[PDB]
């Protein structure tokens, strides 16, 4: 079963993170950008080393497309969180989900 293999392949090679919010103020949301936390990264200086890296959301139960790709654009706040952009806008139903950080840089056009 290909899904079980594709997971183990990704698990061995990537860092792990979770999606927790869109970019927002107290009143309005900006769904083009999403906010991520990475496992053991806990300062803004530590987080700067990931700016530019590729990210992937893998979803095996999906009928349309099994994974969405994206890129980390900027650091956010002072405790090591980041801001990222994806080829499609993330649904509110997909918040709380697991994200993979891929250890190589890509250009803003590739996504």
């Amino acid at each position: 079963m290909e899904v079980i293999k594709k997971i183990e392949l990704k698990e061995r090679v990537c860092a792990k993170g979770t999606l927790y919010s869109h970019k927002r103020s107290k009143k309005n949301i900006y769904p083009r950008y999403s906010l991520i936390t990475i496992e053991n990264v806990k300062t803004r200086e530590a987080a700067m080393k990931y700016v530019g890296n590729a990210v992937e959301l893998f979803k095996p139960e999906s009928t349309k497309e099994e994974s969405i790709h994206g890129i980390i654009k900027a650091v956010h706040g002072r405790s090591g969180a980041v801001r990222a952009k994806f080829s499609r806008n993330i649904s509110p139903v997909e918040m709380g989900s697991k994200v993979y950080i891929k250890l190589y840089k890509m250009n803003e056009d590739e996504i």
Binding site: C14, K16, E39, V41, A46, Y104, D109
Partner: protein, 165 residues
């Protein structure tokens, strides 16, 4: 002039449109990507993407812009000769002393794949040759044979950029 043209056609001088077309094309042209410097013949590298991810392999050459050429060891880990984008490789500080005679080419390892190749494995003279070169450098060395067999696993308890390779 006939009445259909004296009214409808009048909206635009369309003879100008070529000039617009050029400017638009320019703007949406892709940005350039840099060819890296850090890799030397016979560097061991770890594969990060596609069907062969997690295995150690040996880098041979630049090929076609960002494309690079690598060999596994069909005896030791079963991976043959292939091509990949040079960014999908993690560098490590081990360098073998191999030198090759000529240029060779192989199938690309695309990032998106549907199915695993569990069967149907054969070798060319050049695959044989290159293995029978690489193997000599490996046989004489203590645990190197086993090193190529275990997949790589990232440490889940510390930040990646703290580690050295």
């Amino acid at each position: 002039q006939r009445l259909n043209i004296s009214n409808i056609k009048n909206y635009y001088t369309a003879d100008d449109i070529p000039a617009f077309a050029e400017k638009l094309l320019e703007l949406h042209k892709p940005a350039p990507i840099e060819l890296r410097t850090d890799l030397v013949q016979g560097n061991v590298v770890v594969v990060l993407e596609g069907e062969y991810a997690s295995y150690r392999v040996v880098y041979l050459s630049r090929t076609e812009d960002n494309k690079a050429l690598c060999m596994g060891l069909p005896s030791i880990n079963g991976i043959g000769l292939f091509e990949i984008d040079e960014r999908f490789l993690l560098r490590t500080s081990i360098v073998l002393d191999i030198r090759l005679d000529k240029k060779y080419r192989a199938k690309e390892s695309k990032r998106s794949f549907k199915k695993f190749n569990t069967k149907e494995k054969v070798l060319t003279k050049e695959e044989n040759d290159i293995e029978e070169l690489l193997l000599k450098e490996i046989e004489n060395e203590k645990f190197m044979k086993k090193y190529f067999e275990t997949p790589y696993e990232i440490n889940n308890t510390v930040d990646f950029y703290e580690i050295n390779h």
